[PDB]
Structures are given as structure tokens and as C-alpha cells.
Design a protein around this ligand. Structure first.
Ligand code: HEM
Ligand SMILES: O=C(O)c1ccc(I)cc1
Ligand SMILES: [Cl-]
Length: 393
């Protein structure tokens, strides 16, 4: 009753061009079984959304990667928010929500916007740049470690640590195994910076520690919540902003619409999150036998959610394969959905908005002018190198 497929969604051939295999996965049925890894898959919007919004049946505390924490030891202590279920999830989630809140965004917006305009001005002076290293990586590196309150020394560990985190959600393939092999120095740097004395006053890290006296978290929880922001908060935005720039480089008509109304910058970024889905996949584990789209899934089974495929499901989206900066994107699952829906989405959107605003006001054209190289990661979709020529407006 459930179709069995041999597609490996963690293979380099799939990362290289996932869209045919995603259609195959959607059209095979609402629930597939992936024989390569012995997990269930859901690739349509309706089932991805249903799974995300039933945390009791499809839990996160057994790990949101392939590994089942009830069977194997996690490679690092579980995240107190991503890898927790209600009710343990609830109060740590409330603390990060207040740390990364609307009020916080007001304190950081002017500096994030200045840094974005400055970076685009700098890049227009060079003309031909790499939109990954010089822009999608450089701009978040110029604002986010400072917003965390991190010291200068050791920041080169941040992107390696995040690549490790996102590879470690995957199955035990060579991407995962090599990342873990190399991990010790990046873990040791990250874990150290999570301690209260190492986080500068006023930053997100110190704000987490400052919340340890309200009864929501205790002091011994705050290092791991800082770890969550140092895991999720940089590399995701690198690939979100890289997605948007790639979209604008491929779809010049849409750069032109964005130039003509820079207030489209925030929706242009949202649409790039839908269109590319920087965070491709997460897993759940079933806590009971459950009927999902006619298929009966047993207890204790891993379920792989294809967020990017749900975001390109023609059963939900008109012309899903078109980048449309005036699309009504509400409902996409590029940030998740439900109780774990990205708690950092206001930081993500603020960064993406102020960078696309800078491009809209300052850049007349973005032309690819070199070989495009794709970066392979078990969870993140994005580019290694994106050589572009920027023409000034
Ligand atoms: C374009 C940028 C980003 C994307 C695409 C993205 C994606 C996601 C997704 C898909 C989830 C849901 C996880 C799940 O359901 O299991 C999530 C959760 C989360 N994200 Fe984001 N993320 C981004 C940026 C950020 C930033 C900038 C931060 C921190 C500053 C952040 C911190 C978190 C945390 C802590 C969670 C866990 C929330 C919870 O479990 O309740 N993310 N993110
Ligand atoms: O809690 C974490 O470490 C974590 C949370 C969200 C993402 I997306 C990645 C990592
Ligand atoms: Cl760690």
C-alpha cells in the first residue's frame, strides 16, 4: 500500500538537482517508504504541514535527524528547544521568543541596515565579486556574531560548526562522518562561547543568560540555548541570502520589479526562502501507530519531511517553479510550522530584507559571470560559489 522507492535524498546527485526526484516522491503517494535509509517520507504540502502540526504523534525529542535518540547516543547533548517536545519545549521556546522578539529587532535594525548598505557599496567598488563568500557569507558574519555578543577571536569556527550541525542531522554517509571526524575544535570553541562570562553585555547570548531568573529556564540551561543560536543563526541566513541573490541573478525581471519598489524587499526574501528552501528537510519520530494519508505508520518510525518539496507542490502553489516576489507566500514551510516554527525568523527576515533593500536601491543588474559551484550538505541547500558582476544603479 505504501510505495517503496530507492531514491537517496542525501546523495550528491540528489543535492545537485533535487526537483525531478521530489516530483517522483510527491506523485508516488502521500506517504512513501525510502528503502535506502528505512524511513517514511512525506513530500507533499498537505502531509508535511499535517506532520509539523501534530507534535504529539510526530515528536522531536527522539531527534530531528535520522538518528533515533532512543536507540543511539546523540553526537552532542540534545538541543533544549529543537530536540524537545511540549511541555519541556515550552518555556525555553518562550525565552528565545523574547530574546529574538519584535522589541529586540527595533534595537538592532539600524545597525543591520547600515552594514547591508555598506557591504553593497563595497561590493559595487569591486564590481565582480563572489556572491557567496563576499556577500551571503560576509554580510551575516559582519552583523550576527556581534549581535550574539561573541568576541572576535575564533569566529572562523562558526561556519564549520554550523556545517557540522546540519550534516549531522543526515544519515551516516560520508558528509556526516567526515564532519564529525573534524568536529572537536569547533565544538570546543562553541561550547566555550556559550558561558555567560564570554558573551558581551546587551547581545543575544547575554540576554539568554539574563532570563535565567524568571522561572522559565535555570542557569544551567542557558549555555545550550546559546548553542542553539550559534548552531542555527548564521549558516541558515547565509543560505537564505544566497538563495535570494541567486534568484535575482536568474530572474532579472524580478530584480527589476524589486528596484522599482524596494518595499518589496521583505517579500522578495520570503519568496526566496520558499523557492530555494535553504533548510531542506527535518525528521520526526512517531510516538504511536498513526494513519497518515491512508498509510499506517508504526510507533517509533522516522518520518522525513521534505520542506523544499512541500514548498514546490503544485497541489498547493500556482507555478511553484517560478520566483515571484509579489506571491502570497503565507503558509510556506521554509521556516517550519507550528510549535517549533523558526523562533529566529525575525532575525532571518530582518537580515534578508535590509540586504535586498540595499540591492534594490543600489544595483542595476546582477549577471552571473563565472562557474557556479554548489555546496553539498545533508540538510542545507545552497551554493559554494556564485560569481557575479554587479552593475551600479
Ligand atoms: C533563512 C533563515 C532560516 C531558516 C530557513 C530556518 C529554518 C528553520 C526551520 C525549518 C525550523 C523548524 C525546525 C523543526 O520544525 O524541527 C527552525 C527552527 C528554529 N530556528 Fe530557524 N531558520 C532560519 C534562521 C534562523 C535564525 C537566524 C535563528 C537564530 C537567530 C534561528 C533559530 C532557530 C531555532 C532556535 C529553532 C528551533 C525552534 C523550536 O524548536 O521551537 N533560525 N528554523
Ligand atoms: O537548537 C539547535 O541547535 C538548532 C535549532 C534550529 C536549527 I534550523 C538548527 C539547530
Ligand atoms: Cl557542541
Amino acid at each position: 500500500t505504501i510505495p517503496h522507492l530507492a531514491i537517496d535524498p542525501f546523495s550528491l546527485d540528489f543535492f545537485d538537482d533535487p526537483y525531478p526526484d521530489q516530483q517522483t516522491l510527491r506523485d508516488a503517494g502521500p506517504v512513501v517508504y525510502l528503502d535506502k535509509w528505512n524511513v517514511y517520507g512525506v513530500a507533499r504540502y498537505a502531509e508535511v504541514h499535517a506532520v509539523l502540526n501534530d507534535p504529539t504523534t510526530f515528536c522531536s525529542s527522539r531527534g530531528v535527524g535520522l538518528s533515533d535518540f532512543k536507540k543511539e547516543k546523540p553526537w552532542r547533548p540534545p538541543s533544549l528547544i529543537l530536540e524537545a517536545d511540549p511541555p519541556a519545549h515550552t518555556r525555553p521556546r518562550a525565552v528565545l521568543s523574547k530574546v529574538l522578539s519584535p522589541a529586540t529587532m527595533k534595537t538592532i535594525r539600524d545597525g543591520f541596515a547600515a552594514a547591508a548598505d555598506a557591504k553593497v557599496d563595497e561590493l559595487l567598488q569591486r564590481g565582480c565579486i563572489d556572491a557567496i563568500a563576499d556577500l551571503a557569507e560576509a554580510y551575516p558574519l559582519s552583523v550576527f556574531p556581534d549581535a550574539m555578543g561573541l568576541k572576535q577571536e575564533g569566529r572562523e569556527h562558526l561556519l564549520p560548526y554550523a556545517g557540522l550541525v546540519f550534516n549531522a542531522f543526515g544519515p551516516p554517509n560520508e558528509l556526516r562522518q567526515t564532519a564529525i571526524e573534524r568536529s572537536a575544535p569547533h565544538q570546543a570553541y562553541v561550547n566555550e562561547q556559550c558561558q555567560r562570562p564570554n558573551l558581551a553585555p546587551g547581545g543575544f547570548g547575554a540576554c539568554i543568560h539574563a532570563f535565567t531568573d524568571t522561572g522559565e529556564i535555570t542557569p544551567d540551561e542557558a549555555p545550550l540555548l546559546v548553542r542553539s543560536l550559534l548552531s542555527a543563526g548564521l549558516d541558515t541566513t547565509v543560505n537564505g541570502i544566497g538563495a535570494a541573490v541567486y534568484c535575482l541573478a536568474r530572474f532579472p525581471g524580478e530584480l527589476q520589479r524589486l528596484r522599482s519598489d524596494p518595499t518589496l524587499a521583505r517579500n522578495a526574501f520570503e519568496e526566496a526562502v520558499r523557492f530555494e528552501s535553504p533548510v531542506q528537510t527535518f525528521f520526526r519520530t512517531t510516538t504511536r501507530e498513526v494513519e497518515l494519508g491512508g498509510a499506517v505508520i508504526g510507533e517509533g518510525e522516522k518520518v522525513l519531511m521534505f520542506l523544499g518539496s512541500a514548498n514546490r507542490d503544485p497541489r498547493r502553489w500556482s507555478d511553484p517553479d517560478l520566483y515571484d516576489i509579489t506571491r502570497k507566500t503565507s503558509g510556506h514551510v521554509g521556516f517550519g510550522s507550528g510549535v517549533h516554527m523558526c523562533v529566529g525568523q525575525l532575525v532571518a527576515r530582518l537580515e534578508g530584507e535590509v540586504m535586498l533593500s540595499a540591492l534594490a536601491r543600489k544595483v542595476a543588474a546582477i549577471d552571473i559571470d563565472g562557474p557556479v559551484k554548489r555546496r553539498f550538505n545533508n540538510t542545507l541547500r545552497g551554493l559554494e560559489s556564485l560569481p557575479v558582476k554587479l552593475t551600479p544603479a
